[PDB]
Design a protein around this ligand. Sequence first.
Ligand SMILES: O=C(O)c1[nH]ccc(=O)c1O
Ligand SMILES: [Mn+2]
Ligand SMILES: [Mn+2]
Length: 179
Amino acid sequence: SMEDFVRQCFNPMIVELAEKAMKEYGEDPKIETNKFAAICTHLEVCFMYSDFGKHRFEIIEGRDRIMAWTVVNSICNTTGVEKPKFLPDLYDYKENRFIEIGVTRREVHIYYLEKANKIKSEKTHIHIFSFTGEEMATKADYTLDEESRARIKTRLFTIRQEMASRSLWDSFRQSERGE
Ligand SMILES: O=C(O)c1[nH]ccc(=O)c1O
Ligand SMILES: [Mn+2]
Ligand SMILES: [Mn+2]
């Protein structure tokens, strides 16, 4: 059911990446369905984010760990930027900074506090999106123009409403898994 929805609303490439991420962690997407959906949603948000930007953004999320760290190392060696302790989601060649993307079912400020306390690196920019059209970013610097952020918010709200139409939203939002 939730698996059916995930396979019907996300393109096969994102679904395959999410299935691979869960097989890496060791979880079955048919039991941990909310994890599955959250991972698909986060991947799709990262890909939209990087695609709205001469390519401005370098996608790090969605890569196997070897290639992710290869990309991070190459960026740090060609820019002198400090090497993050956690694999970030994108690199911004325009602002020259790593971006950690957050998609939460909780209030954006709660999840922002959580992620900022986690990464504890004053150089990784944080951008939190909610399923309610809310966002919170480091220094209120949202990076993207209004149209791209609007499209991301629209896609997230649409995912939420598609879950609600299938009676999947209550379970998904009451779970923190995937964040
Ligand atoms: O990189 C990850 O593994 C990860 N995990 C949970 C939430 C995120 O936003 C994220 O980027
Ligand atoms: Mn990530
Ligand atoms: Mn992220």
